[PDB]
């Protein structure tokens, strides 16, 4: 059930139109605007359905994006941080996310995609990148990555829960 998860996610995320880069002040405001509306709609729906897994906010310039994500399994709760910046050229090849919380846990991957799984995401994005933006990126890249890594990293012995670190 991979292709169907992918289809559902795009079937619930509203589609954009503009594909501009931050190079142009005005063009960026337009592109950024559609991206925000699509992402806000997605998180509004997702969080309202008590299905929240990520949180993402950005600077007034929309150049750098940051957020956090939480996952639940075996009655335990975990948290992770994320921070990335958009390339000035914004190419057809998707952007790259970084996770400081896991910087050192996961092995140093090849130079280009330290946590950007490529298995199905790279061919999926390359075959279809009409108007795909950050909402689509996270839900079809960050989402599956976390859903693949949580079970594996737990059984392998890399991650643990943090309740016990406090109360």
């Amino acid at each position: 059930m991979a292709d169907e998860a992918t289809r559902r996610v795009v079937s619930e995320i509203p589609v954009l139109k503009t594909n501009a880069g931050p190079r142009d002040r005005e063009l960026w405001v337009q592109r950024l605007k559609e991206e925000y509306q699509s992402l806000i709609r997605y998180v509004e729906n997702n969080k309202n359905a008590d299905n929240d897994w990520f949180r993402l906010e950005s600077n007034k310039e929309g150049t750098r994006w940051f957020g956090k994500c939480w996952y639940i399994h075996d009655l335990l709760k975990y948290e992770f941080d994320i921070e990335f910046d958009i390339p000035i050229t914004y190419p057809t090849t998707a952007p790259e996310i970084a996770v400081p919380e896991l910087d050192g846990k996961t092995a140093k991957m090849y130079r280009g995609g330290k946590i950007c799984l490529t298995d199905h995401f790279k061919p999926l994005w390359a075959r279809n990148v009409p108007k795909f933006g950050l909402a689509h990126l996270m839900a079809l890249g960050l989402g599956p990555w976390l859903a693949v890594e949580i079970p594996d990293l737990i059984q392998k012995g890399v991650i643990q829960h943090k309740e016990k670190c406090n109360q």
Binding site: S11, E12, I13, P14, V15, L16, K17, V29, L32, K33, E34, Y36, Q37, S38, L39, I40, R41, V43, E44, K47, R55, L56, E57, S58, K60, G62
Partner: peptide
């Protein structure tokens, strides 16, 4: 080529500052 059946962004003349403001504020 119209795409009436496909989903479309909630673009109702909102402003960027407002968009990002509700976004960061939503947590």
């Amino acid at each position: 080529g119209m795409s009436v059946t496909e989903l479309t962004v909630e673009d109702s003349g909102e402003s960027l500052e407002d968009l990002m403001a509700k976004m960061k504020n939503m947590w």
